[PDB]
C-alpha cells in the first residue's frame, strides 16, 4: 500500500481497514490508546466522511451562481460570489423573503431536528427506528455503521450490493471529500486576498498567468 509520511505509531493502528488509508497521521490523532470523546478512531473517520460530504455540496454551492450568471441563465442580481450573498454582511447582502436572522432560526430548527436524530444513531445504533416519527422511522433505523446508514431514503438506488463495489465507492467518496475540503479551504483563503469570487479568480489566472498569483497578490 502506498504510504504518505507514515510513522511507526501510525502504522500500528492504520492497517488499510478504512477507505483512503495511506498511513498518514503525523500527529497520532487516531491512536486507540487512551482515546475518547472527540479524539477517538471511530469518531474521526465519521467526522472526515461527514465533513467531506458537506464540502462536496458546498463547493458547488459557491461555484454555481457565479458560473450561471457569467452566462445568460440566471438574473445578474442573483449571481453573486458566495461571500456576497448575506453570509458576510460587511461584503454585502441580498434581500430575501425573510430577514437573515429569521432564516437562521428556521434553519436552526430544521437542521437541529436532522442532526440530533443523526447523533442518536451514533450514541444508540438502532434507537431511531423505534419511536414514532410520522412513519419515517421505518426507514431511519440505520445499519450499525454511523457514516453509512443506507435504507429506503439515504440509499434508495441500492448501489454497492456486493462488497467490492461498496469498498470502491467508499474510497472514491472519501477522496472526493478530501479534494473538496482542500478546494473550500482555498476559497476561504482566496476571498480576503483577492477581493473577487473563485470563478473570477480562475478566469483572471488563465488570461495572464504570470501576473495573477500569490506572488502578485502579496499586496492586498
Amino acid at each position: 500500500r502506498q504510504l504518505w509520511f507514515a510513522s511507526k505509531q501510525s502504522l500500528s493502528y492504520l492497517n488499510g481497514s478504512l477507505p483512503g488509508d495511506y498511513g498518514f497521521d503525523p500527529l497520532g490523532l487516531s491512536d486507540p490508546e487512551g482515546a475518547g470523546f472527540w479524539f477517538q478512531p471511530r469518531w474521526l473517520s465519521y467526522g472526515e466522511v461527514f465533513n467531506g460530504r458537506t464540502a462536496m455540496v458546498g463547493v458547488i454551492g459557491c461555484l454555481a451562481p457565479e458560473i450561471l450568471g457569467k452566462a445568460g441563465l440566471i438574473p445578474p442580481e442573483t449571481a453573486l460570489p458566495w461571500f456576497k450573498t448575506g453570509v458576510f454582511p460587511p461584503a454585502g447582502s441580498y434581500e430575501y423573503w425573510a430577514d437573515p436572522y429569521t432564516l437562521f432560526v428556521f434553519e436552526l430548527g430544521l437542521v437541529g431536528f436532522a442532526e440530533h436524530r443523526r447523533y442518536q444513531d451514533w450514541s444508540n445504533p438502532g434507537s431511531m427506528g423505534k419511536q414514532y416519527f410520522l412513519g419515517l422511522e421505518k426507514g431511519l433505523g440505520g445499519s450499525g455503521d454511523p457514516a453509512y446508514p443506507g435504507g429506503p431514503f439515504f440509499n434508495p438506488l441500492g448501489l454497492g450490493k456486493d462488497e467490492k463495489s461498496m469498498w470502491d465507492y467508499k474510497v472514491k467518496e472519501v477522496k472526493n471529500g478530501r479534494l473538496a475540503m482542500l478546494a473550500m479551504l482555498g476559497f476561504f483563503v482566496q476571498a480576503p486576498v483577492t477581493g473577487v469570487g473563485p470563478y473570477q479568480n480562475l478566469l483572471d489566472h488563465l488570461a495572464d498567468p504570470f501576473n495573477n498569483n500569490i506572488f502578485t497578490n502579496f499586496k492586498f
Binding site: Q9, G28, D31, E33, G34, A35, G36, F37, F39, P90, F218, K219, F220
Partner: protein, 742 residues
C-alpha cells in the same frame, strides 16, 4: 511517544459528597467531636497530596482547580468591563483625560453613604479608581461604552467555558499521569503557542486597531468621529493616509524590505510628548519581535521527531570538579514533585512581578498614566506586595518538598546532597552578612539622628557633610544616557527619561518623568533594602535547609512540615518547623516591602512629580525635601509620616472619608493581631473552661466541645491580621494623600 492519554468517567458527578463534610480525608470524614474539627476541615481543603498518595489523582485535581481559578478570573474581568460600560465616566474622560478623574463605582443612597460619590469631573459623581483601566482601554483603542459591554459578555462566556472545562476534565476525560509528565511538549506549547501567538495577535491588533485610533486621538479629533476599528480593515485607503506604506501591502514583508514599514514600526525610546507614555509604534514593534523570538524558542525540545533537545540530556551533561555528578537526577525530581515546581514557579513569578513594578513607573506604557500619580503609586505598591507574597510562598513550598517528597534512596541528586552537607557554612555566612548590613545601614541613620540632636550637622552622612555617593549607579545612569549615540545608534532616545538625558516631559501642566538624581540618601535606602532582603532570605533559607533535621532535633522530618514544637526540652523547642520559618519571614517581607514603597512614595513626591507653569519652572509636591530629611529617622517620622498623614486624618465629611475609616480599622486590626501573637492557648482553654460551666448551668452547653485554637493556628491568625492591618493602613494613607494632593 507524545500523545493524548485520557481516562473516561473516572469520578461520578453526584451531590452525595457535598452532604458529607470532610469526605476528602480519612480522619475528618468521621464528623466533629470538638471545634478543632471545623478548622481542620478548612486547613486541609487543598492539601491534595495528603488526601491520596496517587500522583495521577493529585495531578487531575490541580488541573481542574486551575480551570476553576481561571473561571473566577474571567468573572472578575467581566465585572470590571461591565462596570466600565455601565457605571463609569470613561466617555467623558476620553475627551479630557487631564482634568477628569477616572471613576467606575457609584454607591447607593443609603444610611448617608452617598457622600462617597465625589466630584470626579465630567458631570459625574462616583469613587475615583486607581486600577489604570481607563488608560489601558484608551491604548487598546476602545472609544465607546458598547465595546466594553461586548467584552464583559465575552468574558462571561469564557468563564462559563473554563468552569465547564474543569468539570469535563475531572469527571469525563481525566488525563493520565503520562500526559502531565510530557514536559518537553508543555514547554514547547507554552513558549511558541501561548506566548508567541498571543504576542503576535496583540501586535496585529495594535498595528490594525490601536495605532490608527490613537493617532486620531492624539491629533485632537473627537472620539465620536473616529472611524470604527473594522473601517480600518474594510477600506485600506483609510489606513494608507496615516501610513502610506500600507499601500504596499505585504510585499515588503515577503521581499525583505522592512525599512519600508518604518512609519509604524520604530525604535524611538523616550515618551510621546502629547501622551506622556511610550510610543505605540515602539510597542507594536516590540511585540512583533517578541513573537518571533518566542516562536523560535518554542522549537528547542524533542517531542516526537528526532530534532530537538532532551531536558534530561542537558541536565546530565552539566557537572564539574566542584559539583560531582551535577544536575543528574533533577529531571526525576521536577517531573514527580508538584511542590518543587510550585516553589520554582512561585519564586520566578514573584521576582517577575517586582521587575514589572519597577519597569512600569520608569517607562509608562499607557497613555496619560504618568501624570495620573494615584494610579502609578497604587500599581507599584500592588505589584510589589504580590511579588513579595509569591516569593514567600516559594520558600514555603520548597520546605514542603524537603519534608515530604525528598528521598535520597530513589531520587538522589548530587547538588542537593552537597548543599545539605555544608548548610552550617551557608547559614553562618548569611548571618554575618545580615549583621554587617544591619549595622552599616541602620546605624548610619542612628549616627545621623544623634549628630543632628547634638547640634553637629557637619558630622553627619549627608550631601553637605561626609558624603556617600552611589558612584556605580551614577555611572550606569550616565552610560544609559549616552546609549543612543554610541552603543544604540539606531535608537533615537534612551529607554527611560530617568537615566539623565537632561529632558523632562510635561503633560497638562504636570511632570511625567525627569532625570532622577542619586545621592547620599539613596545610598542609605538602597543598603537598607539590601539588609532587609538578606534577612528575609536568611529566615526562609534556614527553614528550607534545616527542615529535615538539625543538631537539636535529629529526626525533625517525622514531626511533619507544620508542627508547633517538640516540647520544652533541650531548653525550649518552639517554632522549629519549616512552617514557623515562613511565619516569621512573612513579617520581614512585610517590613522590606513597606520600606520600599515608602522610599518610592517619598522620592516620587519630592524629586519627580509636581507641576510646571508656562514659564519653565517646576514645583514638586514636597519641594525636594528628600535629600536633606530622609537621612534621619526623625525625618521619616516628621516630614513623611506626620506631614503626609494630614490628608487621611482630615478626610471626614468629604468623598475621601472612607479612607480615614479604613485607616482606623487597619490600626485596630493590627493591634488586634498582637493578642494572638503575644499569648498562648493554655490560658485560653482554661478561660473557656469557666464559660463552659456557665453554659452548662443553664443547659446551653453545645455538643461540639469548644476548644482553644491550636498553637499553629494562633500564629497563622496573628500573622494574617498583622499583615492585613499593616497593608490596609498604607493603602488608605497612600490613596488619600495621592488623591487629595495628586
Amino acid at each position: 511517544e507524545v500523545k493524548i492519554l485520557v481516562d473516561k468517567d473516572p469520578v461520578k458527578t453526584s451531590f452525595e459528597e457535598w452532604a458529607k463534610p470532610g469526605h476528602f480525608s480519612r480522619t475528618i470524614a468521621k464528623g466533629p467531636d470538638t471545634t478543632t474539627w471545623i478548622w481542620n476541615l478548612h486547613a486541609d481543603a487543598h492539601d491534595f497530596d495528603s488526601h491520596t498518595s496517587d500522583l495521577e489523582e493529585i495531578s487531575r485535581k490541580v488541573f481542574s482547580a486551575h480551570f476553576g481559578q481561571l473561571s473566577i478570573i474571567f468573572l472578575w474581568l467581566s465585572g470590571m468591563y461591565f462596570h466600565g460600560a455601565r457605571f463609569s465616566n470613561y466617555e467623558a474622560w476620553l475627551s479630557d483625560p487631564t482634568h477628569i478623574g477616572p471613576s467606575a463605582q457609584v454607591v447607593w443612597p443609603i444610611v448617608g453613604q452617598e457622600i462617597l460619590n465625589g466630584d470626579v469631573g465630567g458631570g459625574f459623581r462616583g469613587i475615583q479608581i486607581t486600577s489604570g483601566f481607563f488608560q489601558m482601554w484608551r491604548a487598546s483603542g476602545i472609544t465607546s461604552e458598547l465595546q466594553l459591554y461586548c467584552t464583559a459578555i465575552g468574558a462571561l462566556i469564557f468563564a462559563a467555558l473554563m468552569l465547564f472545562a474543569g468539570w469535563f476534565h475531572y469527571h469525563k476525560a481525566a488525563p493520565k499521569l503520562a500526559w502531565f509528565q510530557d514536559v518537553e511538549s508543555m514547554l514547547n506549547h507554552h513558549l511558541a503557542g501561548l506566548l508567541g501567538l498571543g504576542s503576535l495577535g496583540w501586535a496585529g491588533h495594535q498595528v490594525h486597531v490601536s495605532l490608527p485610533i490613537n493617532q486620531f486621538l492624539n491629533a485632537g479629533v473627537d472620539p465620536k468621529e473616529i472611524p470604527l476599528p473594522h473601517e480600518f480593515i474594510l477600506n485600506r485607503d483609510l489606513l494608507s493616509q496615516l501610513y502610506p506604506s500600507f499601500a504596499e501591502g505585504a510585499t515588503p514583508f515577503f521581499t525583505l524590505n522592512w525599512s519600508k514599514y518604518a512609519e509604524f514600526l520604530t525604535f524611538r525610546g523616550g515618551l510621546d510628548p502629547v501622551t506622556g507614555g511610550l510610543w505605540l509604534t515602539d510597542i507594536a514593534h516590540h511585540h512583533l519581535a517578541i513573537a518571533i523570538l518566542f516562536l523560535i524558542a518554542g522549537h528547542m525540545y524533542r517531542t516526537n521527531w528526532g530534532i530537538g533537545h532532551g531536558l534530561k540530556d542537558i541536565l546530565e551533561a552539566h557537572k564539574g570538579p566542584f559539583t560531582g555528578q551535577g544536575h543528574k537526577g533533577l529531571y526525576e525530581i521536577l517531573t514527580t514533585s508538584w511542590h518543587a515546581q510550585l516553589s520554582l514557579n512561585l519564586a520566578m513569578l514573584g521576582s517577575l512581578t517586582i521587575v514589572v513594578a519597577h519597569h512600569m513607573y520608569s517607562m509608562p506604557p499607557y497613555p496619560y498614566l504618568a501624570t495620573d500619580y494615584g494610579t502609578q503609586l497604587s500599581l507599584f505598591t500592588h505589584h510589589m506586595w504580590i511579588g513579595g507574597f509569591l516569593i514567600v510562598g516559594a520558600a514555603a513550598h520548597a520546605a514542603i518538598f524537603m519534608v515530604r517528597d525528598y528521598d535520597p534512596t530513589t531520587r538522589y541528586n548530587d547538588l542537593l546532597d552537597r548543599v545539605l552537607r555544608h548548610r552550617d557554612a551557608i547559614i553562618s555566612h548569611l548571618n554575618w552578612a545580615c549583621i554587617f548590613l544591619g549595622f552599616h545601614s541602620f546605624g548610619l541613620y542612628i549616627h545621623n539622628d544623634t549628630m543632628s540632636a547634638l547640634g553637629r550637622p557637619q558630622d553627619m552622612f549627608s550631601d553637605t557633610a561626609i558624603q556617600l555617593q552611589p558612584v556605580f549607579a551614577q555611572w550606569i545612569q550616565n552610560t544609559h544616557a549616552l546609549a543612543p549615540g554610541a552603543t544604540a545608534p539606531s535608537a533615537t532616545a534612551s529607554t527611560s527619561l530617568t537615566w539623565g538625558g537632561g529632558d523632562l516631559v510635561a503633560v497638562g501642566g504636570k511632570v511625567a518623568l525627569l532625570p532622577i538624581p542619586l545621592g547620599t540618601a539613596d545610598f542609605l535606602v538602597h543598603h537598607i533594602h539590601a539588609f532587609t532582603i538578606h534577612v528575609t532570605v536568611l529566615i526562609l533559607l534556614k527553614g528550607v535547609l534545616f527542615a529535615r533535621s538539625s543538631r537539636l532535633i535529629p529526626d525533625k522530618a517525622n514531626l511533619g512540615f507544620r508542627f508547633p514544637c517538640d516540647g520544652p526540652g533541650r531548653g525550649g523547642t518552639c517554632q522549629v518547623s519549616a512552617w514557623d520559618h515562613v511565619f516569621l519571614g512573612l513579617f520581614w517581607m512585610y517590613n522590606s516591602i513597606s520600606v520600599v514603597i515608602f522610599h518610592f512614595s517619598w522620592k516620587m513626591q519630592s524629586d519627580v512629580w509636581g507641576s510646571i507653569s508656562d514659564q519653565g519652572v517646576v514645583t514638586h509636591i514636597t519641594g525636594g525635601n528628600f535629600a536633606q530629611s530622609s537621612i534621619t529617622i526623625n525625618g521619616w517620622l516628621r516630614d513623611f509620616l506626620w506631614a503626609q498623614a494630614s490628608q487621611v486624618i482630615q478626610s471626614y465629611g468629604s468623598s475621601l472619608s472612607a479612607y480615614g475609616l479604613f485607616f482606623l480599622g487597619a490600626h485596630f486590626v493590627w493591634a488586634f493581631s498582637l493578642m494572638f501573637l503575644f499569648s498562648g492557648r493554655g490560658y485560653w482553654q482554661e478561660l473557656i473552661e469557666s464559660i463552659v460551666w456557665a453554659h452548662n448551668k443553664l443547659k446551653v452547653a453545645p455538643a461540639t466541645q469548644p476548644r482553644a485554637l491550636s498553637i499553629v493556628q494562633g500564629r497563622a491568625v496573628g500573622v494574617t491580621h498583622y499583615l492585613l492591618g499593616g497593608i490596609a493602613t498604607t493603602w488608605a494613607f497612600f490613596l488619600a494623600r495621592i488623591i487629595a494632593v495628586g
